[PDB]
Design a protein around this nucleic acid. Structure first.
Ligand SMILES: [Mg+2]
Ligand SMILES: [Mg+2]
Ligand SMILES: [Mg+2]
Ligand SMILES: [Zn+2]
Ligand SMILES: [Zn+2]
Lengths: 669, 668, 223, 221
RNA sequence: GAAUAUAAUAGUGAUAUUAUAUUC
RNA sequence: GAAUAUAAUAGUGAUAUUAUAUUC
RNA sequence: GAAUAUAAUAGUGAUAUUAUAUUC
RNA sequence: GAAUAUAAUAGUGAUAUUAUAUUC
């Protein structure tokens, strides 16, 4: 079958004794086989006439499918029916029967959450063992923590019926916003309480075996300087001031910062509610200000990109923006702004092409890559950046740089927003990931971020963090990329806050390990008592925790102030989604075929819908097939709420914050 | 109901088994004639045998009316009455439906489609076919196709029994005959198309018929045109301002039809203008498109102004420029709209003065005033040529204080199937059921009704406002005023109209004379001549291109943007055309369809338009076809371009576009 | 076409929610339109790969012809084939194919009784909605009660397969020879049992409207 | 990454015809099966759904197919399951079949359950796919299944029967000595599987012969 | 334990013997 | 369409903005 | 989306353009 | 030709008679 490493057996030992356990071990030490061990033992412990039922939680589709495959192939020959349920296969199926007629079930926790809430799965007593992959996520309003809220509610209640053993796999329990050992210990105790765990399993007796399988990569800190001469920022700043002058001309903080972004966002939102007796003029003005603020925002983003990369990257970002402004129908003001950008475009591109105006950070990065690949041409590199724009920018920079000809950069990003033509699909991710190897097409992989450990990929002996700030958990997790001996990790940045934050994270790891060592010396009974104490406290707090405005409201377009609909026309589906009735609304919007047609709930996305008045094309929401009907689904964040009586205009980001008389959707209407 | 003698007379040839064309005035009650014929026909069969009748109505209202009447009438006699139309034609066993019913009311297109398919292998399944409005049995009309099947079986070696054929009409027509001989020729050809050997008309009971259906007295009103021409002056140099604008972009009698024809030709000529710079080609072509469109609208406005108020034309242009806005900002549209808005003041100053009035409207007002003064209980029906003129005259009536006694309603067609125009069937039914003596409406403005149609409230006053028609429509319209004292007024400013109506009267004379002459012939001889004409027409009918397999580009006719390639095009049911690939999905926007219908295996969901820089040019529709949600495009929305040569060609219809058409396959 | 009065929607509501229902409302309040509402909703509720089949029961030829005409003219537009079978058109015809190739079938109950008896219609599962005009007749040896005997025998018996929703239409359910409340409730419950009805729908929230439409005449006694 | 000859082999099946796909070993039958299953399952309208059953007569092939199908069809929202002798007993088989769109099955399971009555009819499936369909003969489990199928077909029953796809590299000719006897044998095999079409690669022979090469055979006496 | 297939060898064949492999 | 987490940035905090990622 | 008819205007005509109406 | 329902009158009732209406 397989040869179990001794430290794996050591980690699995408390769990095999039936104790609720949080297994904490280095990333890539083989958690799958520990899971298989604990599960196999758990199933094989039962006598004749009785069986066990294991559930395995993974909050990512790839890990879900991987673990499903592994568990199936491993266990069914033993005679245990293995299955899994995800969002794709959750609708119109008897979950109760599926759970009942199977011995090992792999879930995305939201499935169990929804089925518990719906009542289909009446109790967690049906399971005899629950395993949480990346159990550190069991906090706040996370699905894991919801499931555990159900568990703890049943536990601390007078409810009888047995409860399943709880195992939690992680590489770092975390310490939260701790400053010293005691705070960290309290946090870890809180996490153990959230998982009903009385044991923290770590490797102690087999450390030398573990340290030859999993090596800790050496970390280096690269502090560099920002570009000294920036005429680009001067030109873009002038364009910004001009746009501000136009905006101020219609109606009456350093550029390239996050503060100016927050400001211009606040300003746009504040402009969305500008009132005038003449409504056509109000429309023209609000649209004007919207366009101005949008262009200012784009200019700002460009300045940031230029700050973190080439000037060509920022200029191409702007060119792409103004290109998308075209093919969408020019407004008079859009024409003015496009002209104003076009006049400066020659000077901008001229300054951009100048090799003297290069970013020092890219030079230092190029130096690091050069040295490392010089010492070893077979180097496998992964490069983390904050934004997808910086991803594309850095791939373009690598492919464009003659000094880095030995590199064959690949892209790795999230799946993007569900209703936008961005990101990267899952099979595309898979495709690029299987091509990323020594005997593959890609040498270096440029990525944004990855939730937790995830699927193991080709080992990287070089990990570069390009202006990358994270927590202690993801810091410890990232080590899994370079498990081999001599693996190196650089942290390149031009601001001391990042390096200092990394140092803080390392100290937090020290506090974490020390706190774990301290907790492991406690008696299990005392620890269980403290756990029950924290659980009871949190349950009291949890158990402890507005009039609907029946007045008819107008939902207007945030860009045109055009009448989209009335709240009387709006109907709510399954207490979360919001559609509009009446054939009058049908002429208020246009539609484009959806870029990411997926089937969530009983809804099937067909198209996105936009405003139709005077080529506004502001995003209003989507258009879906819901059971028998073909209906539009709108988001409140696209509209201004004007009270018909008082005339007061308001903005709401989420429907749950919009407290009006919400009439349920009824087919009998 | 107890039969009138002329109905028994008209029915008698049919009841004797003769293939007959029944020709009698509108409103004499053809329904009960059909009921008599069907009843006798079905009841004539012995025990071991059974008859099967099929009734053809070419309109949904007539279809439903006849279905209901036949159902109520023949249910008690033991005969099952059913009906099939487009709404209930899909996914139903037509063969079983026909087989398990004795009387089937049918839209002819259903029978044509099922004959072409093979579900109904032969017309031998029927023993009696009845064509409502049998004068439509000509050319490529569904009736004529059905009869092509009939005659192909007859003249052919097929020994299978053919059904008796009855036609119903108030006028067989004479075509463009100049004399009695040519008229008789045409009528004989119609009798041949329907395989009729007898033409049934009232003879021995004319005195009875004339006391049920009275011929309304016709009056001819020739008035003077607009002597004034200030409005036309303004709009004219507006039009050569626009024409100069269009001329200042590329090289190379307003208010008339010739100018409309010409400007259509000009637009279609500008659509194929090419350049090295394709973007400037796009800009210039869009420019020319806009200019030509504005010129067209100005021309239309002039026509409206000559046939109605200047205010109506100005409101037409106002609505047009209102829809130019809310579609998007265009530099040129802003320019033109400005150029119009600057002269709006003078235009409305001219459209406000009361010295400005159309003598035609004043004469119409005089007629209405006199008639309603003589009789306030008058129920008027007013026919015009266009829906624009419908709305115009409605507004003119409701505006004029001297017509306060009028309660104007509207009656138009259903308009083009994929546009937000016209009027739905239940709306028509609503206004019509309101249009009565003691109803809500006194006068009903309308365009044209297909043949006779359902009987509406009797109109003792009919007015033809600039309205020409054939002899069939002239004879049929008399049904609107069957009561004695009914009057008709042909109001116009053209001698052409009057002359053509007089020509129509003479054609009616020729028709009746030719019929009466034909009714004297020996039936055997007539059957011989009919067989002769049928054989000749079949010989002619059975008379005697290679598809260009080279890939082509489909560009937008307005902005010359690339929609798709012919290689991406697939053909569904040998008629419809869809596009494959995710690329095309990025090329168009869509709006929910204004008239969602379930034609064929398709269900209309949306209209699709060009997406590039708010071009918004109609490309077609978006439909639900079985399991798939797919776009369907019309070729008349695109310019075809060859890859190699670079030629640009236009096609108004897909069947004229002889390229390599790949059948749509679900397995792709 | 017209437009539904509120109390008609109120009466139709339990039926549209799929409940077996006896609709009891004053004569002339407009029951045909209620029937049309229920039928339209019922037929339009099915997904693409499915279809409903409604049967309407009138025990009089005039009502039969009336309902046949109305339903035909109404549902022809929506693409639902409407037919009917009376005693005059029931012989030497394939009843099973007629029922199969139609979405709405108006029927004299005796036709269905005889065809269930012969076996030409093997089960009521072919229908998804049965409507009984004047449902109070569902008692003793009335054809309605025979049909519902078949229905109930399929329900309670080892017999399965889907049973059609059952609607009844009346102005009065009756109380039989009841002498008090309990006996009347006994009778009404037994009628609901005969029709397999779980809900009795009456006007409550829109009484004012109905009373403005349907007035109770003043009764005088002349000895 | 579908090859053209795979699409060619899958085309008759995708058109709803009962088909015996005959193609060289190693040309990639799994992907053809995946295309067929995918198209078949997606063809059904909203108010309906299909149910595929895949017969493998060996445990390794069973496991492999179950794995590939589960990994492939998970994203498409189709529940894939499997039943073998290792997980056959004390578990509601009918409930499993009902609660899954694709069922990978060793034929003896279906034989046992059909004869036991837990699966009342093959009408529960809309598509059956016999791996190595040349075994559909004599008293083989495949042939027993098809005996149930054909008994239902030729019987008075009006219940809908599933589409039938057979997969093989060789239909065989039995003890045929001439083309007529071989023709009769092959026709009999098609009758055993209710097949009306034999799918072979015709238009993409170049591609196929570039993917699969015929090894040279030497005779050593 | 039972069932199934293929090959060889006997018999006109049904079938049988062995080998090989598979399944419940 | 909605929900969730992490990070940065404002606020005493609740929370808010953006970025990033995940899920139904 | 497609098909059909009528009328007017161009052309010797096939036909073409627009208007109007109808149907699948 | 047959079946069904309601009402009145008889009978403890089953049921019967007539009237009335409906259906095949
Ligand atoms: Mg006009
Ligand atoms: Mg994160
Ligand atoms: Mg009675
Ligand atoms: Zn808008
Ligand atoms: Zn365009």
């Amino acid at each position: 079958p397989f040869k179990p490493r001794n430290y794996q057996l050591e980690l699995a030992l408390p769990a095999m004794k039936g104790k609720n356990t949080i297994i904490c071990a280095p990333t890539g030490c083989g958690k799958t086989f520990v899971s298989l061990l604990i599960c196999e033992h758990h199933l094989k412990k039962f006598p004749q006439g009785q069986k066990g039922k294991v559930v395995f939680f993974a909050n990512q589709i790839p890990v879900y499918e991987q673990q499903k495959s592994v568990f199936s192939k491993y266990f069914e020959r033993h005679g245990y029916r293995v299955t899994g349920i995800s969002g794709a296969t959750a609708e119109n199926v008897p979950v109760e029967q599926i759970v009942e007629n199977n011995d090992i079930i792999i879930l995305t926790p939201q499935i169990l959450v929804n089925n518990l809430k719906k009542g289909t799965i009446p109790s967690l007593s049906i399971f005899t063992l629950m395993i949480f992959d990346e159990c550190h996520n069991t906090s706040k309003q996370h699905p894991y923590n919801m499931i555990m809220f159900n568990y703890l509610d049943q536990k601390l209640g007078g409810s009888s019926g047995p409860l399943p053993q709880v195992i939690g796999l992680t590489a770092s329990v975390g310490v939260g916003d701790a400053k010293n050992t005691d705070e960290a210990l309290d946090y870890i105790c809180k996490l153990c309480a959230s998982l009903d765990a009385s044991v923290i399993a770590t490797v102690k007796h087999n450390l030398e075996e573990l340290e030859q399988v999993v090596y800790k990569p050496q970390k280096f800190f690269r502090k560099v300087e920002s570009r000294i001469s920036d005429k680009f920022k001067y030109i873009i700043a002038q364009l910004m001031r001009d746009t501000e002058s136009l905006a101020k001309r219609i109606c009456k903080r350093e550029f390239g910062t996050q503060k100016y972004e927050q400001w211009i966002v606040t300003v746009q939102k504040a402009c969305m509610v500008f009132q005038m007796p003449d409504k056509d003029e109000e429309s023209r003005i609000c649209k004007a200000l919207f366009l101005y603020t949008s262009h200012l925002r784009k200019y700002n983003d460009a300045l940031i990109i230029s700050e973190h990369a080439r000037m060509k990257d920022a200029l191409d970002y702007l060119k792409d923006f103004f290109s998308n402004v075209r093919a969408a129908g020019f407004d008079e003001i859009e024409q003015d702004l496009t002209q104003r950008f076009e006049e400066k475009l020659q000077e901008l591109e001229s300054v951009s092409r100048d090799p003297s105006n290069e970013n020092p950070k890219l030079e230092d990065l190029c130096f690091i890559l050069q040295e490392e690949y010089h010492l070893n041409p077979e180097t496998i590199t992964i490069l983390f950046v904050k934004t997808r724009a910086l991803v594309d920018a850095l791939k373009n920079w690598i492919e464009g740089n003659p000094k880095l000809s030995f590199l064959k950069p690949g892209i790795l990003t999230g799946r993007g927003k569900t209703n936008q033509n961005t990101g990267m699909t899952l099979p595309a991710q898979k495709c690029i990931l299987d091509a990323f190897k020594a005997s593959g097409d890609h040498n270096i992989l440029i990525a944004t971020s990855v939730a937790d450990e995830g699927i193991d990929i080709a080992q990287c002996n070089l990990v570069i963090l390009y202006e990358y700030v994270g927590n202690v958990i993801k810091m410890i997790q990232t080590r899994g990329r370079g498990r081999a001996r001599g693996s190196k990790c650089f942290l390149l940045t031009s601001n001391a806050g990042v390096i200092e934050k990394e140092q803080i994270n390392m100290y937090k790891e020290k506090m974490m390990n020390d706190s774990i060592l301290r907790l492991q010396t406690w008696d299990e009974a005392v620890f269980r008592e403290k756990i029950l104490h924290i659980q009871t406290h949190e349950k009291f707090i949890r158990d402890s925790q507005p009039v609907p405005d029946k007045e008819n409201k107008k939902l207007l377009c945030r860009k045109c102030k055009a009448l989209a609909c009335y709240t009387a026309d709006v109907r709510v589906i399954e207490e979360c989604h919001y559609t509009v009735l009446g054939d009058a609304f049908k002429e208020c919007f246009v539609s484009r075929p959806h870029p990411k047609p997926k089937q969530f709930s009983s809804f099937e996305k067909r198209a996105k819908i936009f405003c139709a008045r005077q080529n506004c094309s502001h995003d209003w929401g989507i258009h879906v097939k819901y059971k028998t009907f073909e209906i539009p689904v709108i988001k409140i964040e696209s509209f201004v709420v004007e009270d018909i009586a008082t005339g007061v205009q308001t903005l709401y980001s989420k429907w749950k914050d919009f407290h009006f008389e919400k009439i349920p959707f009824d087919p009998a209407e």
